[PDB]
Design a protein around this ligand. Structure first.
Ligand code: SAM
Ligand code: MN
Length: 624
């Protein structure tokens, strides 16, 4: 029942992609020559490689195609579905539903209502719902916006149209007397705001042809007034603010812990939210402190000051008003410039070491800064990252470059984070293998697509935790939360990052000489087996470094339809100070990292390798 709303959102993004690919000859091209790499498709259709990569990943996730071992795209039988889509269906992204209701339009939507009644002339249930979403999303939102949700206030023609539609969808019934919204109907109305984020990108999605095959900057160029035209930003902010706020309550346990920590005088004074928006999160945190923490009993003697930072002056004004009766400060700032933030805070006389930094859902929407560490980026290019990211020319940014960009961005933040740490909520993309497997249960198909199309910078959850670990930021175990809770995929993380003295990164082939010399729980591993492990999973073996010195490393195996992660090797160097604590930290990180690893349902070996490091002398490690 709840899978219907998700499928509608899938269709809202997928139908523009499918129709644009169809009209351009993508499916014909992949028929005349059955195995093309991305760049051959780009070349022959004069496409934009970045947006096209977004479209191909979406098509792969819908099982319309797959990639060979050589990364060639091959169509499946499902791809024939593109012929079922009526190509005039794209007109609905431009149809004045506001005028249709109120009856000030020449042409109604009877044709589409009839299409939906016939399930769009296919027995593919998923496909029928994808097509429905193109119609039902704008219609349901306009019906909501005008408080029409019965139809006794519309003209008789309009009433019959929508009564037919609603009755065919199981949304309304009339047994005795008049109409009545069913449970499903009542639920679609009561959840319409969740569709508002996806719906707000209708202008961009209408121009999918331009993104894939034309000049993408025509979609995004802003006028003198600086209004965005790829998205209805005002509706977007309302809708996404409503969705983001659903995760603010997971900060409560973190805030309560922080402001229960004795002694009061050593707790934070300032709580600084980068990208504060309307200040909803700052307001919530202050109320939680006041009601539920030890700090809240002594604010008279030890005041808390809430600080809202935003690069938009109107947001500072709204936040200023929303934080009335709370001691607060509003200042300009940018997620990309923590060093300027620190400078402005010092200018205010704010003691930097007294700051708890916080933010929600902003790192992926930062202005992209290209990597400056060209050497470390090159090392990275051998790893098998699947991050899709698109530049202002519509060209694909190589995954390792997008990752290096995130690492350097977090490094700038890492250099200012205090003992109080960094409260950080973020949303994440998934891989197509996992999106394909959980298409009904997860939002990723449409959400990852419209994020990449609009040149935002999602990464998979494990990539994000790795990027943080590479710069010494570690998500504290007692604060951590991931969603969806019970599926083997992570779209949202709630983190309290603390700064530590060491870093964790992926082991590489270049580390094998150092690794060979470590003490090891299993008998000394030789080079070929290290090579086997690194080759089959280049981004699944973790190592902890301190002041350029290897301290410990954990190798893993991924098995059983890639559902099971298992600990495979445990290496340490016992000449490094505090090595045993550090090695236990690494094992704890591997568990957290494994929990958010796309597609992993369980982790094997934690008990066995925990005992090995905990009772080290009794476990008789080799080469110690
Ligand atoms: C990112 S959404 C709201 C974020 C908010 N923390 C949340 O969880 O919903 C838009 C808000 O973030 C701000 N914002 C967008 N980009 C920013 C940037 N690069 N630096 C600082 N603030 C930014 C916008 O001005 C707007 O107030
Ligand atoms: Mn976003």
């Amino acid at each position: 029942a709840l899978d219907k709303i998700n499928r509608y959102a899938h269709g809202f993004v997928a139908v523009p992609v499918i129709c644009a690919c169809s009209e351009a000859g993508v499916f014909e091209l992949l028929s005349q020559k059955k195995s093309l790499k991305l760049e051959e498709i780009v070349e022959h259709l004069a496409a934009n490689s970045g947006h096209l990569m977004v479209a191909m990943r979406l098509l792969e996730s819908l099982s319309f195609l797959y990639r060979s071992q050589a990364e060639e795209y091959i169509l499946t039988e499902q791809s024939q579905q593109h012929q079922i889509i009526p190509k005039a269906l794209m007109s609905l992204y431009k149809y004045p539903f506001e005028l249709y209701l109120k009856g000030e339009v020449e042409t109604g939507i009877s044709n589409w209502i009839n299409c939906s009644s016939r399930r769009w002339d296919t027995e593919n249930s998923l496909l029928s719902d994808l097509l429905d979403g193109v119609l039902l999303i704008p219609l349901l939102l306009e019906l909501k916006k005008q408080n029409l949700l019965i139809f006794n206030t519309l003209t008789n023609s309009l009433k019959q149209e929508l009564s037919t539609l609603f009755i065919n969808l199981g949304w309304a019934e009339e047994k005795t007397e008049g109409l009545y919204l069913t449970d499903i109907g009542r639920f679609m109305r009561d959840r319409s705001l969740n569709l508002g984020t996806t719906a707000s990108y209708a202008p961009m999605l209408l121009q999918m042809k331009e993104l894939l095959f034309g000049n993408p900057q025509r979609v995004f160029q802003r006028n003198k007034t600086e209004k965005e035209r790829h998205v209805n930003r005002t509706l977007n902010v309302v809708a996404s603010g409503f969705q983001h706020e659903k995760f603010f309550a997971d900060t409560d346990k973190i805030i309560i812990s922080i402001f229960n920590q004795q002694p009061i005088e050593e707790q934070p004074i300032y709580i600084v939210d980068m990208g504060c928006g309307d200040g909803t999160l700052l307001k919530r945190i202050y109320k939680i402190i006041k009601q539920f923490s030890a700090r809240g009993k002594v604010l008279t003697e030890y005041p808390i000051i809430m600080v809202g930072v935003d690069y938009n002056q109107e947001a500072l004004d709204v936040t200023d008003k929303n934080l009335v009766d709370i001691p607060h400060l509003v200042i300009p700032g940018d997620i990309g410039a923590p060093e300027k933030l620190l400078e402005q805070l010092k200018a205010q006389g704010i003691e930097p070491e007294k700051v708890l930094h916080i933010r929600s859902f902003l790192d992926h929407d930062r202005p992209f800064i290209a990597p400056k560490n060209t050497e470390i980026a090159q090392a990275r290019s051998q790893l098998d990252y699947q991050v899709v990211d698109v530049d202002r020319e519509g060209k694909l940014i190589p995954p390792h470059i997008a990752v290096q960009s995130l690492v350097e961005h977090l490094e700038r933040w890492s250099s200012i984070i205090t003992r109080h740490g960094l409260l950080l909520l973020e949303v994440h993309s998934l891989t197509p293998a996992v999106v394909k497997k959980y298409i009904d249960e997860s939002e990723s198909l449409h959400f990852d697509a419209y994020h990449a199309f609009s040149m935002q910078h999602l990464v998979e959850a494990d990539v994000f935790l790795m990027a943080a670990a590479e710069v010494g930021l570690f998500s504290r175990k007692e604060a951590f939360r991931k969603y969806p809770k019970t599926l083997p995929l992570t779209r949202i993380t709630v983190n309290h990052f603390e700064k530590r003295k060491y870093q964790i990164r992926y082991a590489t082939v270049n580390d094998i000489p150092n690794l060979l010399k470590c003490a090891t729980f299993n008998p000394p591993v030789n080079e070929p087996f290290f090579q086997v492990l690194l080759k089959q999973t280049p981004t699944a073996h973790l190592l902890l470094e301190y002041q350029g010195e290897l301290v410990a490393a954990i190798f893993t195996e991924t098995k059983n339809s890639n559902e099971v992660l298992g600990i495979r090797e445990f290496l340490v160097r016992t000449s490094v100070e505090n090595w045993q604590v550090l090695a236990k930290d690494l094992l704890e990180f591997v568990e957290q990292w494994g929990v958010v690893k796309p597609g992993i349902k369980e982790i094997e070996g934690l008990l066995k390798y925990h005992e090995a490091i905990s009772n080290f002398q009794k476990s008789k490690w080799y080469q110690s």
